[PDB]
Write a protein that binds this ligand. Structure first.
Ligand code: HEM
Ligand code: HEM
Ligand code: HEM
Ligand code: HEM
Lengths: 282, 146, 146
């Protein structure tokens, strides 16, 4: 995820943070609780009053973990292995909150490091915090053999309808989430549109290819990865909306096959596909 | 909450056929299986280790029924979701400490379950109407958070 | 858009110290650098090949001035963001085809720029106030999307 120049900027920025990591860490959490009050639901056992020893201590633990991460940027999943376990199995924090903390850590850094917080270093830091968040949420639920079994079973039954289901998924998405239509100003989006049919089929075919190469997805989708990142430039948030509408389409067509277990495996599979397709964006 | 006449007719019409009991247990169970971190609120429900355990758990079925029963009542007051859910909103914040992002997840799971149950009858325009409704309910439940 | 009197005063007090042209150039440039997919709208602006080229691009700075001036004007109508931005909303949807997620990214980049610009004066409660306002602006700009 991180280029070596990225790693250079983070180490330069964090070193300068230095012995202030603790106080900056506490400030970041205080900013989050105030700006995003829903995050307080994970701390009902804390005194969240300003300057609270619990917040100060928590901030210092969190900053140290980030220092450890900066120190081993080339091996983050192993360095944060324990913390990964802890968040996935015990704390069980919804992944959306990680983006909120990352944003407040950036605001904190910005307010304290005027000289250092250049546009390039800003970018690198945002990428680094996203990578940390990814590692910390990586064991929450990549595809186990049972998942891969469930996906191939489900997609096999799709079979020769894969095209028509793909069109339906897109149609469902444009109607349910109208903001996605901004990427298609050059299409007729009316029901039955042959443009939507052709697009849906191409997308479906691409997913068939991913299923076939489920163990080697980054290479099989590499070209599509390049296309979305550097030409189409679709905001990553939209991939979750299409994934949901694919799930709904499958559920509507596979009464027997869409069990809770297969539902979970499909959701994981579509999230991995989405991760691959946005991997080269930055 | 504003819907078009077409949207409201579709939502109310399909809901008349929903057995809230059966759909509610299905919806909560799939939430716990597909997004297992949500199990953090239900430690007292017993055995949640496998999908088969979750889906057949009596506490899960019972709670699902309660949750969708309240959802059902909200469907009778689409024009005023914030007013309808204010008390439950305060409860989920102050007593239960539930991250409102969970309301969004359940919303989407419920749409999947309706598609699974009703098949082709759950058409794209019908789904769009339900997506507006579950977003409206989630926002209403999150409204009194502080 | 509902703020407390304190929150509104803190927002306006700091904004009086803002050089809008400068900060607009800064915020748009950092958006294009930090989230490069947003460059898709601006291929007619010329060279965006490196951060310095973006930050130094005259077309970028000019757009940044235009955008933050309308934001600035909006701060005088906090009680009516939706009405103030209705026509801008229709234009960004029907003509400019801008995914409203971009408005949220710009809001967050702007908050960072204000922190960089004002340092310790950009306190946690002042940031909280600005976070409500940029969400309010993003929501109002997305309101007429269809
Ligand atoms: C950059 C992201 C994060 C890092 C590096 C991180 C790291 C840590 C660390 C090091 C601990 C303490 C472990 C110990 O006791 O030794 C911890 C605890 C905890 N974290 Fe995370 N965390 C992150 C994000 C989050 C987010 C986004 C939330 C919730 C909004 C969260 C909530 C918690 C909770 C509730 C605890 C336990 C507090 C206690 O009772 O002491 N974490 N975290
Ligand atoms: C599972 C996720 C996705 C996959 C596998 C996928 C795949 C594809 C494929 C195979 C193509 C055609 C490339 C060619 O012409 O050879 C394509 C094009 C395109 N994709 Fe994606 N896509 C995904 C998600 C999205 C999302 C979420 C959006 C936007 C809401 C999007 C927007 C587009 C656009 C704008 C085009 C070009 C259409 C045209 O003008 O022909 N994609 N995608
Ligand atoms: C459609 C959204 C929802 C509605 C309308 C709803 C409604 C309700 C109602 C009516 C109760 C009954 C409490 C009582 O009898 O005093 C309740 C409690 C509760 N809800 Fe919610 N709920 C929703 C979503 C959720 C979600 C998604 C979660 C967490 C993942 C959740 C967690 C809880 C918990 C933990 C309780 C208490 C259970 C107990 O007493 O053991 N709720 N809910
Ligand atoms: C604070 C949020 C924003 C406000 C208040 C705003 C406002 C404006 C204004 C006042 C115009 C001029 C329209 C006219 O000439 O009638 C404009 C145009 C435009 N905006 Fe937005 N904008 C915002 C966000 C964005 C973002 C984030 C993007 C895309 C990344 C964007 C892309 C554009 C484009 C491409 C144009 C037209 C360029 C031209 O014709 O020269 N806007 N914006």
């Amino acid at each position: 995820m991180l280029s070596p120049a990225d790693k250079t900027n983070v180490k330069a920025a964090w070193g300068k943070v230095g012995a202030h990591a603790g106080e900056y860490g506490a400030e970041a959490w205080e900013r989050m609780f105030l700006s995003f009050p829903t995050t307080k639901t994970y701390f009902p056992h804390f005194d969240l009053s300003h300057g609270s020893a619990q917040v100060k201590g928590h901030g210092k633990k969190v900053a140290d973990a980030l220092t450890n991460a900066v120190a081993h940027v080339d091996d983050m999943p192993n360095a944060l292995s324990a913390l990964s376990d802890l968040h996935a199995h015990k704390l069980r924090v919804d992944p959306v909150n990680f983006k909120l903390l990352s944003h407040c850590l950036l605001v904190t850094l910005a307010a304290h490091l005027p000289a250092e917080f250049t546009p390039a270093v800003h970018a690198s830091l945002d990428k680094f915090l996203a990578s940390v968040s990814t590692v910390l949420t990586s064991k929450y639920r990549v595809l186990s053999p049972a998942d891969k079994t469930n996906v191939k079973a489900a997609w096999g039954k799709v079979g020769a309808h894969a095209g028509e289901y793909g069109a339906e998924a897109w149609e469902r998405m444009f109607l349910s989430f109208p903001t996605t239509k901004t990427y298609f100003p050059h299409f007729d989006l009316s029901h039955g549109s042959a443009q939507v049919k052709g697009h849906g089929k191409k997308v479906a075919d691409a997913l068939t290819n991913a299923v076939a190469h489920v163990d080697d997805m980054p290479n099989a989708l590499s070209a599509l990865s390049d296309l979305h990142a550097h030409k189409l430039r679709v905001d990553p948030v939209n991939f979750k909306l299409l994934s949901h509408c694919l799930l709904v389409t499958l559920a509507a067509h596979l009464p027997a096959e869409f069990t809770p277990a297969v539902h979970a495996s499909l959701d994981k599979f579509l999230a991995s596909v989405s991760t691959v397709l946005t991997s080269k964006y930055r | 909450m504003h819907l078009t006449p077409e949207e409201k007719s579709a939502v109310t019409a399909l809901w008349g056929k929903v057995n809230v009991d059966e759909v509610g247990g299905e919806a909560l169970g799939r939430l716990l299986v597909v997004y297992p971190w949500t199990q953090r609120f239900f430690e007292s429900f017993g055995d949640l280790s496998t999908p088969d355990a979750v889906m057949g758990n009596p506490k899960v079925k019972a709670h699902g029924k309660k949750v969708l029963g309240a959802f059902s009542d909200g469907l009778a007051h689409l024009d005023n979701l914030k007013g309808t859910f204010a008390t439950l909103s305060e409860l989920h914040c102050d007593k239960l400490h539930v991250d409102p992002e969970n309301f969004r997840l359940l919303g989407n799971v419920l749409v999947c379950v309706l598609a699974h149950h009703f098949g082709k009858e759950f058409t794209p325009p019908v789904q769009a109407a339900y997506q507006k409704v579950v977003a409206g309910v989630a926002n209403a439940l999150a409204h009194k958070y502080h």
